[PDB]
Design a protein around this ligand. Structure first.
Ligand SMILES: COc1c(C)cnc(Cn2cnc3c(Cl)nc(N)nc32)c1C
Length: 430
């Protein structure tokens, strides 16, 4: 496909640049970001793009609010080999003189640059354009520039061992690494980059199956379909935009922040027993501490979800328990103190003496058909042998209901559980 160029030197400076010493706080901050902080250095590409989005949205918003039309709202990257530069321009809202004089991920630029050169023109009516110059140490210069398009153009003059970010290939890799889901069109050297839609940001109402399937296949790198889907948004405990998938196939969740990738392989935002879940979690509250915060609410709502699933459909949950009950048992055993154990145990389903043999039941359901109070269960090789066990018959005219485990790990699980809400766990062999 033919090329889309919106990057050229249309800017000039007529007068002199006013030199300006940076505030004590902000130098310290600046080469904290440039020297101390980010592990990966590539992420500057990620942060600038992030800014490039924000501005753009606030352009759209304003315009859409005022009721006036929309210009070409795009993000562009260009790499120059001989000049050793990388440039990112966005046609979003701009920057007043004030803002310039006074996004912070921006400073990550100086991780890779020996000098940074910015041109910016506010979208505000009548706004003038400006040139901003810095070498990354306490001093920057500001001129009034002309031929600055509305939006912001950032030119990075790369360091020596940082010039790898001048090759279209490398930059392409970084871009598709952290930014397949950027909301506005993104071009590298004239060529469109991303195509994927952050459907997790949408209204759960508005995403249909075909999509959820697409995304499922992307983040799970799978070819089956999600047997289960949970689109969870919340603003109360923490900021969360997430989607969770349970595969058709029998036997990881990516962590994004504002449609931007933080960690693809992020197995700390969910309990180890919920590792069979696929999908995405997006939280603004993210740079191990808070991840704990997050993960806890994630676990509780996923438990909630599967409980609701048992109710909304019994048989499909039966197959789900057959294929994924391993993780639930393991997670019950692993859980440190009781409350969590019981919570996860609300997901277990087993046969009953009363129920027709095939039919299943949670401990919860067992506790209602009860008389006010104790559990009873039994590992036996099958139903036949179980309800023919003299221990069960012993339990004929005591008019008591007993659960049937047919595998040792089931009974070991019920044993470890010790008890479940105000009733205690005991086999009919004691
Ligand atoms: C000139 O350099 C900056 C200074 C000194 C402080 N913050 C920002 C980030 N930033 C603030 N508003 C921005 C908009 Cl509208 N767009 C972009 N891409 N970055 C912005 C930039 C780029």
């Amino acid at each position: 496909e033919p090329l889309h160029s919106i990057i050229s030197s249309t800017e000039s400076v007529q007068g002199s640049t006013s030199k300006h010493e940076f505030q004590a706080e902000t130098k310290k901050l600046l080469d904290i970001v440039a020297r101390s902080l980010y592990s990966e250095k590539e992420v500057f590409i990620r942060e600038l793009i992030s800014n490039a989005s924000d501005a753009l949205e606030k352009l759209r918003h304003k315009l859409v609010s005022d009721g006036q039309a929309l210009p070409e709202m795009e993000i562009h990257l260009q790499t120059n080999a001989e000049k050793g530069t990388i440039t990112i321009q966005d046609t979003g809202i701009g920057m007043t003189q004030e803002e310039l004089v006074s996004g912070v991920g921006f400073y990550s630029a100086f991780m890779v640059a020996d000098r940074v050169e910015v041109y910016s023109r506010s979208a505000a009516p009548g706004s003038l354009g400006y040139q901003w110059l810095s070498d990354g140490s306490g001093v920057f210069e500001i001129a009034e520039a002309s031929g600055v398009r509305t939006g912001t153009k950032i030119i990075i003059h790369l360091k020596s061992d940082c010039k790898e970010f001048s090759s279209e290939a490398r930059v392409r890799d970084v871009v598709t690494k952290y930014s397949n889901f950027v909301s506005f069109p993104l071009y590298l050297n004239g060529r469109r980059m991303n195509t994927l839609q952050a459907i997790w940001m949408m209204d759960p109402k508005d995403v249909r199956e075909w999509q959820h399937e697409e995304f499922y296949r992307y983040v799970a790198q799978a070819h089956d379909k999600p047997r289960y889907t949970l689109h969870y948004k919340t603003d109360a405990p923490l900021n969360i935009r997430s989607i969770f998938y349970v595969p058709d196939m029998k036997p990881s969740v990516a962590l994004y922040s504002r449609k931007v990738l933080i960690q693809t392989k992020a197995t700390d935002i969910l309990p180890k027993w919920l590792r069979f879940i696929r999908g995405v979690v997006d939280s603004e509250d993210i740079p191990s501490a808070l991840i704990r915060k997050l993960r806890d609410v994630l676990q509780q709502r996923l438990i909630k979800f599967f409980i609701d699933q048992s109710k909304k459909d019994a048989e499909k949950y039966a197959k789900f328990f057959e294929d994924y009950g391993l993780f639930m048992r393991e997670g019950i055993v692993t859980a440190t103190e009781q409350e969590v154990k019981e919570d996860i145990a609300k997901l277990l389903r087993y046969e009953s003496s009363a129920l027709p043999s095939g039919q299943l039941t949670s401990l919860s359901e067992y506790a209602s058909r009860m008389r006010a109070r104790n559990i009873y269960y039994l590992c036996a090789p099958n139903r036949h042998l179980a309800e023919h066990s003299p221990y069960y018959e012993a339990m004929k005219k005591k008019d008591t209901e007993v659960l049937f485990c047919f595998e040792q790990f089931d009974e070991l699980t019920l044993l470890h559980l010790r008890e479940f809400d105000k009733k205690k766990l005991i086999s009919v062999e004691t």
